[PDB]
Subunit: 126 residues, 6 copies
């Protein structure tokens, strides 16, 4: 299952843009969260994308002119990230698969946590 | 503040061991989570450590013979991680610094999520 | 077009095994060539795969038990390599796409050039 | 012998320029090929240089202001590349050594395949 | 002891600046040496700092806008370097720690060997 | 001149062994120094070799089954290190080149400083 040790969610992007994570499907009516994380890098950025406990749905898109792909754990495959919410990259908690899913109706209701959500660009010096 | 874009929490470790994350201070009686994340690497492991929405305390320790340090964003400083829950590395949500705190009172009530919490070892091919 | 500058063919594998290249569709009555290139690496091996002048078809498989993917140029996507001749990774000269093609009818006529064909594992010190 | 598994031909260059490969000594009257491959990198470029089946001579030069060296396999030695066709770097099929050779008599006959010959710059994300 | 095998002195800096080394406490009235080593790198520079035989004191500072840290051997800790001679990073021969020492009284007697002392920036291609 | 900024002395080795430095040609009646620096590494080790102030001769050998080469600054060329004191790699202070020199006559009178001379293996975390 994605997010377990060995099945971590990594993203690789090229050039500048924003990776946005939608955290939703909250247990016990917990509020959905949406936050955009910018990169100004000209080249490749590597990213770690985390879940939050007590949520069952994680959806993400890339907004940038360059490519963006996800990798599961140390798997070799790198597959394109969704580029709009009607064809978002989505994980159902417990799934081993990223699917394409329309989450356009979830986005406006989510609390805005731009630059403070669970997706992180790795620096030059790690 | 740590966990904001630019102040991401990275850990570097040497040799095999377990990084354990205690997620606590949950809003509205959300249950605390404890999970250990193993590595078997003989050398260096790099890690990205995430928060979870709706929690306000994040405590971590390293259990291994080899060193463990944290780095904030692309800062050059690397400082040691705590090695037991009585001297845990702890972050209070909104703080810009890691402190040393005894969280032994929080551990017994935490639900075990070994290999499925918000700390991730970076693989060899990222 | 694959094999042109900017669209070089790279392979990424995990663990030991043989990458086997079938060079075929030769002009000027040229004999097809088949050659297996071994790696003994436990971890990730990166590879550069070249065409040969005067041939119009290039087909390859990974015979190892670990994962294998190809990357075109500095593209981010990495997609699985074929694992049998009936589902080979195949390039038609001039195409920008690696297709899946059955080349079992070509293999028996090819001259064996094991360890001496146009696929190369990159070393640890490049 | 160079181009066999273990004795792969790699180039290292600094700054922008063209690596040009002459493929000649074609069996059965096969047409010699010349093709220049550009790099615009300001720093180091690593390259993989392939042979073509049915040819028995491979000559290459670097036209760039910066340095250029070849490495055989995982050998540590890096030695300078020829900088003109009268002092080309040349491999005789079956040889274990790159020698200096004057191939100006071969170049005029060769068909131009610029940006489409068997020498490849490795990208930033391999 | 620092400068023994396993306890090599490395520095990590960000951005352009100069690292200066004061070699002093020479036996047999050997003259003290001071030399500044510049970098123009915009990003992270890694440095190896050597002692000289027959000296008992080694002091160093970083002059630059960006951060500077030292690391001992393959240890994970990175700690700040001194930024003026009144607060120098200093090693007493045989000591396992870097101390803060005011060596303003030593600096005038030293011979200037800018760009020719025993601290070295590591290049892009090592 | 070797050892000036831009012309730093680096070594690359494969497999386990020892790099030995002989510091001689001392001014001010200084005794010659010899010291072996071992590595246990199975793969490639990178090294920084420093001079000592007040000496004019620096001679080094690699004793190991595996290859060993030197590189000057960020130059691309890598050339073999001497494998015995009768064929040492030698630098005359002020020279821009490494020569071969027999220094067997210096060795017996040199003070032994094994694991404590000015040649350093670079670690995995730099
Ligand atoms: C183990 C796990 O992931 N369980 C998921 C279920 O979530 C747990 O449900 C029980 C109630 O039966 C408790 O509410 C528990 O707190 C829930 O776990 C918490 O939330 C999940 C989503 C994880 O983040 C977990 O680490 C956290 O402790 C869930 O109800 C079902 C269906 O959605 O999925 C289970 O996999
Ligand atoms: C913006 C933020 O991080 N706020 C923190 C407070 O948490 C929010 O509290 C409000 C009510 O005042 C709501 O309960 C809101 O849902 C809370 O935010 C959620 O939980 C926090 C911890 C973050 O994970 C956030 O992204 C998430 O939406 C919090 O009560 C106090 C505790 O000191 O800190 C505030 O910084
Ligand atoms: C430029 C090119 O790639 N052309 C391909 C054609 O191959 C050439 O065909 C001509 C006659 O039409 C000659 O036979 C020439 O030698 C051929 O080029 C040689 O072979 C090709 C496959 C490449 O390796 C090239 O570099 C080499 O010189 C080919 O016949 C057609 C049909 O397949 O494809 C053309 O793209
Ligand atoms: C095995 C090999 O490399 N052989 C070289 C000879 O080339 C082969 O010659 C035979 C005739 O004896 C056939 O014509 C065969 O198709 C030739 O092999 C082809 O060309 C060589 C150059 C390689 O690319 C090979 O993979 C390809 O199948 C060759 O005539 C002589 C000349 O130097 O060298 C032999 O090593
Ligand atoms: C082993 C060592 O570091 N010795 C230090 C002493 O220095 C040596 O002193 C003896 C006389 O007792 C000789 O003069 C000898 O040459 C000195 O060693 C030389 O200088 C030292 C600092 C090192 O660079 C060494 O490699 C070099 O050969 C020193 O006198 C005392 C007190 O400061 O410390 C000893 O550690
Ligand atoms: C600047 C330099 O490297 N000079 C070398 C000369 O060394 C200096 O010689 C004078 C007397 O003429 C003093 O003895 C002085 O202390 C010497 O400099 C010291 O030693 C040299 C080897 C360097 O380590 C230097 O940094 C240190 O201060 C040397 O006499 C001549 C001839 O060998 O070469 C000069 O390049």
């Amino acid at each position: 299952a994605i997010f377990h040790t060995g099945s971590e969610l990594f993203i690789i992007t090229r050039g500048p843009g924003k990776l946005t994570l939608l955290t939703w499907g909250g247990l016990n009516n917990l509020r959905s969260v949406i936050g955009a994380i910018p990169t100004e890098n000209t080249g490749v950025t590597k990213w770690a994308v985390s879940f939050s406990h007590n949520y069952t749905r994680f959806s993400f898109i890339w907004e940038g002119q360059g490519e963006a792909c996800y990798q599961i754990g140390n798997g070799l495959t790198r597959s394109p990230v969704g580029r709009s919410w009607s064809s978002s990259s989505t994980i159902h908690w417990g799934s081993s698969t990223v699917i394409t899913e329309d989450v356009t109706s979830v986005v406006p209701g989510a609390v805005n946590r731009d630059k403070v959500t669970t997706a992180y660009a790795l620096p030059d010096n790690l």
